[PDB]
Amino acid sequence: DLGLWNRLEPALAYLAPEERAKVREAYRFAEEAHRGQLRRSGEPYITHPVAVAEILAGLQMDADTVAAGLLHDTLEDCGVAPEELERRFGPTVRRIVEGETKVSKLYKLANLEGEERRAEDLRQMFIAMAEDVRIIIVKLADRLHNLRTLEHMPPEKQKRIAQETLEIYAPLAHRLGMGQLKWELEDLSFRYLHPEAFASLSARIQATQEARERLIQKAIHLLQETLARDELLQSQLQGFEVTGRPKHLYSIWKKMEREGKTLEQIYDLLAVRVILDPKPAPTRESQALREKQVCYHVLGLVHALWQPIPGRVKDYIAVPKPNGYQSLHTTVIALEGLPLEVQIRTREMHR
Length: 351
Ligand SMILES: Nc1nc2c(ncn2[C@@H]2O[C@H](COP(=O)(O)OP(=O)(O)OP(=O)(O)O)[C@@H](NP(=O)(O)OP(=O)(O)O)[C@H]2O)c(=O)[nH]1
Ligand SMILES: [Cl-]
Ligand SMILES: [Cl-]
Ligand SMILES: [Cl-]
Ligand SMILES: [Cl-]
Ligand SMILES: [Cl-]
Ligand SMILES: [Mg+2]
Ligand SMILES: [Mn+2]
What we know:
Layout: H1 4-11, H2 17-33, H3 47-58, H4 63-71, H5 74-77, H6 82-109, H7 118-129, H8 134-148, H9 155-175, H10 179-193, H11 195-228, H12 231-235, E1 237-244, H13 249-258, E2 270-278, H14 284-305, E3 307-308, E4 314-315, E5 328-334, E6 338-346
Parallel strand pairs: 2-6
Antiparallel strand pairs: 1-2, 3-5, 4-5, 5-6
Helix pairs in contact: 1-3, 2-4, 3-4, 3-8, 4-6, 4-8, 6-8, 7-9, 8-9, 8-10, 9-10, 10-11
The structure holds Non-hydrolasable alarmone analogue, chloride ion (5 copies), magnesium ion and manganese (II) ion.
């Protein structure tokens, strides 16, 4: 057995049972449609829309979006008409899979090459044609998985796709507030577009990586304990996760070229992330309050645990960034005299 559903299924627990039922129906429909089809990796095609759905489930997208992630390829390859996807999964799931597949072609057609701000007018083209932003998110999840599996492609295609992601899709994830997605698109694009510079920067970081993650883990273990042993915070919380922030390799090398610095000359600010999953609240309004309330509760315990550097609290929950970015940030003195940046946000805020 393929066993792809058994990997996706756990990621779907945030959906109501009726919604997970729509996603199982979508999985089987995709399973049937792509039967016998193969990816250039030698893996059966279904591996891709399952990976794409899995990315959207990680991002906690609505049921129609994740089901559309499984069906996002069925129309072109498999003798499936859009009428079938609307008849079987409703018009929003069709709308989205039709939109993700249709835009792929528009970018092929569009004449903007070597043009002053060509990516700006091409990014706006998708923005203008796709009023339901879910279409863009599915396209971003698709491009991410394609990049994740870019080794099974000619090196010519590898750089064409990496550059296109760097001009179009990574900036589109920025506009949409999907920074988690944006970072990964950037680093994966950087890997294939400039391989020589990626392999050199990665090697330098892999020398101090033994000590850096050793320190970051002391702070993670300590902050995990502190949060878990706080009875009131846990009373309003379903779950939580404390992680180390990954080095944004593309941005690190980008600032080295611009500021004319070396990887030794640039300051490695250690950062940790607290992701909070609040417990289901009896009303929609009470759920919204809990979301805010739980991040400020954490800010306080972080300040009880580590001494806060003055003027480093940043409240993007009260005042989100222009792309709708919401998180709380505080720079503290942790690790015996070291600056540690703490990012605090909910599961819903983590995009
Ligand atoms: N990255 C990657 N892509 C793979 C793999 N196996 C198959 N592919 C397909 O290659 C495709 C690369 O793009 P393409 O060159 O435009 O597609 P094509 O018409 O040459 O494809 P076929 O040889 O007929 O399959 C890609 N298409 P997709 O619709 O997802 O996205 P696009 O880039 O916006 O057009 C993949 O589905 C694989 O292992 N990795
Ligand atoms: Cl069925
Ligand atoms: Cl834009
Ligand atoms: Cl962002
Ligand atoms: Cl982020
Ligand atoms: Cl410490
Ligand atoms: Mg091709
Ligand atoms: Mn696809």
